From a paper:
Retromer is a master regulator of cargo retrieval from endosomes, which is critical for many cellular processes including signaling, immunity, neuroprotection, and virus infection. The core of retromer is a trimer comprising vacuolar protein sorting (VPS) proteins VPS35, VPS26, and VPS29. Here, we elucidate the structural basis of membrane tubulation and coupled cargo recognition by metazoan and fungal retromer coats assembled with the non–Bin1/Amphiphysin/Rvs (BAR) sorting nexin SNX3 using cryo–electron tomography. The retromer core retains its arched, scaffolding structure but changes its mode of membrane recruitment when assembled with different SNX adaptors, allowing cargo recognition at subunit interfaces.
Using local reconstruction and three-dimensional (3D) classification, we found that, for both metazoan and fungal retromer:SNX3 datasets, the arch is asymmetrical. One VPS35 monomer is more curved than the other, and the two monomers interact via an asymmetric VPS35:VPS35 dimerization interface. This asymmetry causes the arches to tilt by approximately 22° away from the perpendicular relative to the membrane. Arches are assembled into linear chains via two homodimerization interfaces—the asymmetrical VPS35 dimer interface and the symmetrical VPS26 dimer interface. Asymmetric VPS35 dimerization has possible implications for retromer function. It leads to an asymmetric VPS35 surface at the apex of the arch to which cofactors could bind directionally and with a stoichiometry of 1 cofactor:2 VPS35 molecules. For example, a D620N mutation that is associated with familial autosomal dominant and sporadic PD causes loss of affinity to the family with sequence similarity 21 (FAM21) protein, the retromer-binding subunit of Wiskott-Aldrich syndrome protein and SCAR homolog complex (WASH). D620 is part of the buried interface in straighter VPS35, where mutation may disrupt the coat. D620 is, however, exposed in the more curved VPS35, where it may contribute to a single FAM21-binding site at the apex. The interfaces of the two VPS29 subunits at the apex of the arch may also be differently accessible for binding by regulator factors such as the Tre-2/Bub2/Cdc16 domain family member 5 (TBC1d5), Vps9-ankyrin-repeat protein (VARP), and RidL, the effector of pathogenic bacteria Legionella pneumophila.
Numbering used by the authors:
A (entry chain C), C (entry chain A): 12 to 780
B (entry chain D), D (entry chain B): 1 to 182
């Protein structure tokens, strides 16, 4: 409708205008008659809660001009006695009580001696109140009137003036209990179908109720002991006695927010035991979270003593929240976890130091999850969402992942999760383990981490299943790379053991995996092999350590070999050979010779492509050429075996290149006979170039024939200028002649020109032609 | 224009990344060219490179996974004709005479190669030879003491100034070397 | 109506009854009164010419019975004079004159002295008649009466009989002029709207006209000399002067049919000048063809003088026809060519000797086509049809095709063919040039052939050629077959050149063509290589010739390689390798090695299919082994490279079979060290079988495992009995047993039984059973 | 029943058709069976065959275009079990011992094969071996003198008489050979 309101405010402004008119003209009772008829305007009630409220606030503001008028009058001494009796002539209860409050506060100001008596009267006679709307607005007027003048402790105490802080406290608690009664009574008045309207209106009025607590809080007298003994005992008596939920919850959060934590800390177990008896339909969770948030901002609030050690917050709150959960019957487990998250945050921020607390947290979370007969929680469940948000907090907050390995009870948490979520989180954690460089680990914790890796590399949707996905796969390697790196920073004796557990682990890796994982391990072996020789003084079994580790490498390599691979094992034998060569230990030649024959075997057996041949032989020659530990009895077999194998190849072009490459084998070929230098028998070098020449004379391809002569010519120059006396200048002349008598017979091509440039540069450099 | 020359990163075979300080020196915008000798190995390292600049040139190293890279390549940079090869194809491995023999065939003014993991910048018979080394100080059986490093050259015109970046101790020492066409 | 007709035929039958009644009772004049009554029936105008014809034939055939009746009475001596006046008593002119003719011939028989006079009388007395139909029917009665009594060569020369051949000729020339006058007047009589009725009617009476010439032809007295001077000269003046087309054409056809070639050869050209002035609207082609047909049956007519050489008939008719065509206004070109076709057939069959004539004709046809600036001939156009039919006479007739190839203009006429028609007609012609097998061809004629192919196969298609079926998809086989055929007849070194030109020629043929064309050329090369060996006694530079021919083949084949095919070239390489091997020239070994390595190259690069894998490698192995000129130093490497290539395949079954097949390679090999004796490398053969065995033991697939064991077993027996000591009988016992201790561990199959039979037969074959 | 056995026509790879005289001897109606060893190559030759008779059997030769033919096939003709294979799969190519080894596996009384282009009709250990040769005298690198030929056998019952048709000179010589199950 909304008209009632404007018409009413019109009539109100009329009567309060004629009211203030009579009050300036100083004929009081006529003003009080207009004021009375005006408050008669409040006898309509159909107004909206908001509308009625505005009319109320309007009339209160006009009454303020009256209150200051009276206050002045009494301060001027012009006081008429017995005002309550004369005013009780007003036939209705409403004028009487508006008059009583108004004159009461004036007398209290003017007669502080009368304060106790007037308050005790007003508090006792308000028990008459039974109607919700007018009673509410009256007791609000009471609350605003009582804003400041109530007894207090730092107040002048005239033994005529009676009333103390205890009296003020009793005053407000009593008026509160009566108003809250009417307000809850508001739940059931009217028809049961206005319940949402009713609850909306009450929600609107909740601030009216909380204003009592605001009033209680400005009371200077509120010491911790009064808070302990009086305030909470009264409030908890009504709360436990009211067994409602909407009001209790609102009022209790307002308390939480309002009072200082100093008072709360002295009154926690009473307040939390009270919290535990509350109604089941209550979202206690949001309350508790608000509480946790307030004590968290209280923990890291500095400019304070910190947490007194006698105050074992965690044990207290833990046991009471626990009691609250027992008191709760239908808790969503997700809600339990949302609280567990805040329980983490608290333990984390107040005591990073004390891990046993965190473990007690993990044990209670675990016990919760076990009593829950839950399967590995899929992506859809909010429960997994929460468990994720919970667990990442230790994961995110504990910068050092080594510290996690001090928590044995963490690993049990992996169990409850889905494989997909385990995979996501395991990626998240290990990524954190690399981002936060957390380094070389204790063996047992190395074990448990390796157990975690074994779960990553061995499990699939939530069991090992191959449902193939075209997607990346190489996210798992770099991680292991890092692991392996930090692993090597132990002392010598630890590595063999760590190496063995790493070995078994990768043995359990698979077949689709190990090709990329083991190479780093190979380099590990090498560096430690280097460590043993560089430390050949304080160790006497270092040569033995080298032998065992090289045997270890051989098996590991053979492991890679069974996967039916070629390239990698070939290279791993080369690197191992080189290492043993540099170490030069006892039996080192024999070991190297063994490692070599494995390499040769791989070469023959695992020989595939022309390109692959050239690459394999180039690697064999480069490794072979600097190897110098073998004496002629050992150097010579391999030497001839290599010469023949090489001379067997596929393609004549490549054939000529290889045969020419072999020269170096006859020149760099240095064995332990005359103590590492080559005997320098020009003759075998000559025969080598001879076969190369023969192959040239057979190629019969202009373009390639010429190109090959220019290379072999340059090669000749290298050895002539390398003082191979056998290289006569006469041979070079006869051949250059042949090359001259052939060079013209060419078409135009991109190469022939470059071959000319090469040749011209070559003749221009040397000057000895 | 200035070009960046690096290689033999060997990630993740022997190293996990470039030294901390070096990463702080290689930022986008400055580099217009990148010639990579070595086997960075993982495509992960190719992308990072693709960050510092857009025109990247890579040759196949003896341990690179992708076989699609060139054994050797010749790229022209202004007045300069530059060759690129990893080095393992040059026998003996770091032999100047063998590198030189290679220079003739390519017909380049400057020849970039790695494989030895030892920085080298020198002139020989009017030609220039550069070996960046290993940007990650990657392990190498032949040399027990490897020093991280890369090298960016600045070409104005028929004149090059190559800056060698070594990681000795904590600080990053530097050295200047100039070369100009004959 | 047809009724008019029926009433007439009834009254006729009535009246012919009255004839026979009067003929019985000898009342002639009473029969003739009724004869007059029949002819009154002829006064009708409503009947059709055919209807009149039927009624006439009825009255004529019955009147002959009267005529013979009268003739008999007169033959009986009862001769009555004064008949001329009495017959004039008939009121109708027709009965009078019919009586005059009937009795006249009677007087002629009874009074031969009067024959001349009576005939001249009757021919002159016909001036009475002027109506076309009845006059015609009269003159028919005349023609049948005079059919036999006219003078001729086979008449008795009785000094009473009168009248000669000259009288007969004057008689018929007159009757001709008279009948054509009446007949032509029939053209313009009646309304012009009966043009189709008149011309149909004319067609009907046309036989009446031709019967006169039939009568002239039975006349023996029609000799060649009267025909030459007088008869034909007379006939041609009336004929040419009638300046009509329908009559001229009919009479001329009758002419063609009627006169002998005896008359025609002496009178063609006078007659042909007459032919030249004729009326424009007539079809002359049909005239000329009829003439051509008769002179054609004269050309191939035996037991006759043929054509005297002095009278060059063809040149005469050619020149006259040319003049006639000049005289023609716009005569369709297709018709000129239909005439050209008969001029071809004629010159060929009547003057086979003079091809040069046919060339003068083809050249003149060319000037005609050049003069006619016409666009290409549409597929519908009859002109192309005829030009095709024209060209085939040489094609079908002349078995000799070089002379066609000597026709320079034979190709230029092709211009007028449209592209679709160029394709269709060129295909048909060349196909005909092929269906006769063609022998050796000279370089120049290979050229003209190559021009024919280049026009047949491919210029740029007229439109971007859209092909449901691009040809008869491969219809060009015979073409290459023949090429190849004639090539082996020319002497050798020229052939190589021709083969090179053949290469360039087909190289320019197209894109998807040459794939089928060059292999045969390859076979050519071989045979020429064979010719070179057959010339191995007088020649030493044969090896140089060989070097060039194999080098030519190498390029050509590499060309085919670019065309991106693998298998076929592989076999072509095999054959080339074999060829060089058999030739055994210097550098032959090198040649064999390229063919092998390029083939291997193809194997590696172009490898896609497992089946293709097995087939290509089995063929490679089977093909090499006969390669036996190689030095052991060279023979041995290549063998191993092949063995290795084999050992790198994917699938284990095939791998085992192949590895076992390779054994023969290690034994059947022969070294050039043993002067042709086999190297006998049993040891390596054994090792081959060893590795094979190990691979066998891994089959673990029962049926094939065992069957494969059986082959390896056969291999052992083969070598044991082949004096190969390493093959012990103990191994064979161990293996037969193992197969025995395993054969049961099998479910029975169609095979397992055969495996027992095989094993028993195998042991029995040792003569040890 | 009488069967016709031919192959290695090699049309149009090396020959364009069967010799003139032979065509005059092979006419429809007479033949009830046809076993073709060789690669006739072109489907054009398969149709001609389909003329002489209706039941034609062909095995894939080393040069046939259509890959749809059997590598080998076993066809029963009355009392006789006959095998068919081109021959190129038999190594060494025309080796009797290898053919025999093949006979066991097939378990046939008679074995027809070609590839060598040399007519052969002989008995071995109670089994019969036939090689028609090349109906067109098709070229063959191993033998410089090939003789056209085909062979039709006549089976009464557990008794065969094979007629070999050779084209020597102009006239067509013939030879008779009889075989009867063991």
């Amino acid at each position: 409708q909304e008209k009632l309101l404007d018409e009413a405010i019109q009539a109100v402004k009329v009567q309060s205008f004629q009211m203030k008119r009579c009050l300036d003209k100083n004929k009081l009772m006529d003003a009080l008659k207009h004021a009375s008829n005006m408050l008669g305007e409040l006898r309509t009630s159909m107004l909206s809660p908001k509308s009625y409220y505005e009319l109320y606030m309007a009339i209160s503001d006009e009454l303020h001009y009256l209150e200051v008028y009276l206050t002045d009058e009494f301060a001027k001494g012009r006081k008429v006695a017995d005002l309550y009796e004369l005013v009780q002539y007003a036939g209705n209860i409403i004028p009487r009580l508006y008059l009583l409050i108004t004159v009461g506060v004036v007398y209290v100001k003017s007669f502080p001696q009368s304060r106790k008596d007037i308050l005790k009267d007003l508090v006792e006679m308000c028990r008459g109140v039974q109607h919700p709307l007018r009673g509410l607005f009256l007791r609000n007027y009471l609350l605003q009137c009582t804003r400041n003048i109530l007894p207090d402790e730092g107040e002048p105490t005239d033994e005529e003036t009676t009333g103390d802080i205890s009296d003020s406290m009793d005053f407000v608690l009593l008026n509160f209990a009566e108003m809250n009664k009417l307000w809850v009574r508001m739940q059931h008045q009217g028809h049961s179908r206005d319940r949402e309207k009713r609850e909306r209106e009450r929600q609107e009025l909740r601030i009216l109720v909380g204003t009592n607590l605001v009033r209680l809080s400005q009371l200077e007298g509120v010491n911790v002991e009064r808070y302990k003994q009086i305030v909470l005992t009264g409030i908890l008596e009504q709360v436990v006695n009211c067994r409602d939920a909407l009001a209790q919850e609102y009022l209790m959060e307002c308390i939480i927010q309002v009072f200082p934590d100093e008072f709360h800390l002295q009154t926690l177990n009473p307040f939390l035991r009270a919290c535990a008896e509350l109604h089941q339909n209550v979202n206690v969770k949001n309350i508790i979270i608000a509480l946790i948030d307030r004590l968290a901002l209280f923990a890291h609030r500095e400019d304070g003593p910190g947490i007194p050690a006698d105050i074992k917050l965690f044990d207290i709150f833990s046991q009471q929240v626990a009691t609250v959960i027992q008191s709760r019957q239908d808790m969503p487990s997700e809600d339990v976890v949302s609280l567990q998250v805040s329980l983490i945050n608290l333990a984390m921020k107040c005591y990073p130091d004390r891990v046993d607390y965190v473990d007690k947290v993990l044990e209670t979370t675990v016990e919760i999850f076990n009593k829950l007969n839950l399967e590995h929680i899929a992506t859809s469940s909010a429960v997994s969402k929460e468990l994720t948000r919970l667990l990442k907090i230790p994961v995110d907050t504990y910068n050092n992942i080594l510290t996690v390995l001090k928590l044995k009870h963490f690993h049990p948490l992996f169990e409850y999760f889905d494989y997909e979520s385990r995979k996501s989180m395991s990626c998240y954690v290990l990524s954190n383990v690399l981002d936060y460089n957390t380094e070389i680990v204790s063996q047992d914790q190395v074990d448990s981490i390796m157990n975690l890796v074994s779960t990553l590399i061995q499990d699939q949707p939530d069991q090992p299943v191959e449902d193939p996905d075209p997607e990346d796969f190489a996210d798992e390697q770099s991680l292991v790379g890092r692991f392996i790196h930090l692993l090597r920073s132990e002392d010598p004796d630890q590595q063999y053991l760590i190496l063995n557990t790493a070995r078994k682990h990768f043995g359990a890796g698979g077949n689709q995996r190990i090709r990329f994982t083991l190479p780093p391990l190979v380099f590990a072996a090498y560096q430690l092999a280097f460590r043993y020789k560089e430390n050949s003084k304080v160790d006497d079994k270092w040569e033995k350590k080298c032998q065992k580790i090289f045997s270890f490498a051989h098996q590991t390599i053979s492991a890679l070999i069974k996967a039916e691979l070629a390239e990698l094992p070939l290279r791993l034998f080369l690197q191992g050979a080189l290492a043993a060569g540099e170490i030069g230990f006892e039996n080192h030649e024999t070991v190297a010779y063994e490692f070599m024959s494995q390499a040769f075997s791989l070469y023959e057996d695992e020989i595939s492509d022309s390109k692959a041949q050239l690459a394999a032989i180039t690697l064999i020659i480069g490794t072979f050429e600097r190897m110098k530990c073998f004496s002629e009895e050992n150097h010579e077999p391999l030497r001839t075996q290599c010469a023949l194998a090489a001379s067997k190849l596929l393609k004549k072009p490549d054939q000529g290149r290889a045969v020419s490459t072999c020269a170096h084998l006859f020149w760099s070929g240095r064995n332990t006979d005359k103590n590492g230098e080559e005997l320098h028998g020009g003759k075998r070098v000559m025969e080598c170039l001879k076969k190369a020449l023969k192959i040239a004379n057979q190629c019969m391809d202009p373009s390639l024939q010429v190109q090959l002569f220019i290379e072999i010519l340059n090669r000749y120059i290298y050895f002539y200028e390398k003082e191979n006396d056998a290289v006569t200048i006469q041979v070079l002349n006869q051949l250059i002649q042949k090359i001259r008598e052939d060079l013209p017979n060419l078409e135009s091509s991109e190469e022939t020109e470059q071959i000319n440039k090469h040749f011209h540069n070559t003749l221009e450099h040397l000057r000895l032609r | 224009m200035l070009v960046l020359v690096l290689g033999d990163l060997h990630i993740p075979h022997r190293c996990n990344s470039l030294p901390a300080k070096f990463k702080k020196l290689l930022v986008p915008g400055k580099i217009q060219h990148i010639l990579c000798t070595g086997n960075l190995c993982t495509k992960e390292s190719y992308d990072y490179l693709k960050t510092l600049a857009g025109d990247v040139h890579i040759v196949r190293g003896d341990f690179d996974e992708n076989l699609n890279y060139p054994e050797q390549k010749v790229v022209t940079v202004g007045q300069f004709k530059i060759g690129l090869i990893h080095g393992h194809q040059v026998i003996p491995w770091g032999d100047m005479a063998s590198l030189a023999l290679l220079q003739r065939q390519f017909d380049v003014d400057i020849l970039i190669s790695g494989h030895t993991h030892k920085f080298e910048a020198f002139e020989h018979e009017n030609k220039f030879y550069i070996n960046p080394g290993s940007a990650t100080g990657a392990y190498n059986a032949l040399e027990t003491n490897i020093i991280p490093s890369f090298v960016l050259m600045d070409i104005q015109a028929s004149t090059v100034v190559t800056y060698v970046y070594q990681l000795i101790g904590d600080d990053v020492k530097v050295e200047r070397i100039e070369y100009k066409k004959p």
